[PDB]
């Protein structure tokens, strides 16, 4: 019943993959495909996981998701599609005796993208506290949730995809979160767990052209 078949890799060719301008390194790699008999459409939509540190040679525990939207000059162009953290960091985040807060909210954009962002916070220990457990009461918790929502709305209420990607590459949103919260109590780790794209417009050409070859833009 078994049959031999010709080697597939005698009819293959590679294509390069490029990232937006926000990052110093933009060559993601190469992708093989099978000869048209059409390569352009089949490789039109593919998602590549990229570690942030490799994009910007702190940055070793975050990775982005990038999807191709256009193939031109035999090279593929990509834009933002999602951001997440590594699993080992998340596992490390947890410690007994502390309280955990996870919040998610939906945020629209000027471009029509709608995003859901996940935020995680933990409490810490006071410097000269007699007790060893670092739990807190309820009013404190509701205050922290309200502060998270308010700060996220203010610093991301209105934004564009390039601005959002620049902010994620930096950590100013996390910095604002921690400074807003720290005025309440001792928080331990505060940051963004991940970002998802809920719905996007069908056609994204001006945005790719903006994201790619932005240079000074």
């Amino acid at each position: 019943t078994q049959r031999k078949n010709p080697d597939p890799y005698l009819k293959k060719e590679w294509y390069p993959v490029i990232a937006p301008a926000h990052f110093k390194s933009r060559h993601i790699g190469q992708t093989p495909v099978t000869k048209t008999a059409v390569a352009t459409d089949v490789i039109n939509h593919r998602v590549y996981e990229v570690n942030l540190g490799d994009l910007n040679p702190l940055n070793g525990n975050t990775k982005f998701y990038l999807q191709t939207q256009l193939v031109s000059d035999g090279k593929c162009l990509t834009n933002f599609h999602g951001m997440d953290i590594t699993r080992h960091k998340y596992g490390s985040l947890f410690r007994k005796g502390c309280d955990c807060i996870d919040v998610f909210m939906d945020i629209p954009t000027t471009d029509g993208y709608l995003l859901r962002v996940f935020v995680i916070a933990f409490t810490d220990r006071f410097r000269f506290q007699r007790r060893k457990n670092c739990h807190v009461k309820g009013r404190v918790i509701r205050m922290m949730r309200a502060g998270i929502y308010e700060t996220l709305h203010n610093e991301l209420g209105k934004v564009s995809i390039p601005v959002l990607v620049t902010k994620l590459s930096n950590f100013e949103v996390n910095a604002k979160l921690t400074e807003a919260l720290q005025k309440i109590t001792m928080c331990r780790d505060v940051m963004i767990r991940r970002v998802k794209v809920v719905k996007r417009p069908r056609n994204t050409m001006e945005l790719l052209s903006t994201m790619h070859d932005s240079n000074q833009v």
């Binding site: 060719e13 060559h27 790699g29 093989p32 593919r46 590549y48 080992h88």
Partner: protein, 139 residues
């Protein structure tokens, strides 16, 4: 192979792929894909290199399969890989088998450069009921 049938050579970077390891309690899989998982360059399993069913997850078969994979992928022009080490998961053991370390070493000494490493075991925030009943495997 013709030059077009291989990754383009450029000194700026090196031909980077991704390797998926399935370190189960009954079998081991070593799988190579591009940056995305939509294609495949080399797929091998420990059940090809042994005749005894219980030895399929044994590390020796893992090493043999791994070096065969190294030969094929080096023929196809791939030198550096990323590691995605995975267990069965899904209301299961959640601990690796004994073929994983063998695969890692065999890649390392096969002249294969190493990049990043992450855990890819499927884990839930919930749980469907697992088999065995409320008394468990009584043996």
């Amino acid at each position: 192979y013709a030059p077009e049938n291989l990754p383009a050579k450029n000194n700026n970077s090196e031909a980077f792929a991704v390797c998926h390891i399935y370190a189960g309690k009954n079998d081991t899989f070593i799988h190579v894909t591009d940056l995305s998982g939509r294609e495949t360059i080399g797929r091998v399993s420990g059940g090809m290199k042994v005749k005894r069913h219980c030895d399929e997850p044994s590390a020796y078969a893992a090493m043999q399969a791994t070096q065969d994979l190294i030969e094929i992928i080096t023929d196809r022009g791939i030198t550096a890989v990323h590691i995605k080490i995975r267990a069965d998961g899904g209301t299961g053991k959640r601990v690796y088998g004994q073929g994983g370390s063998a695969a890692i070493r065999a890649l390392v000494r096969g002249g294969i450069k190493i990049g990043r490493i992450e855990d890819s075991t499927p884990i839930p925030t919930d749980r469907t009921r697992h088999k065995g009943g409320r008394r468990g495997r009584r043996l």
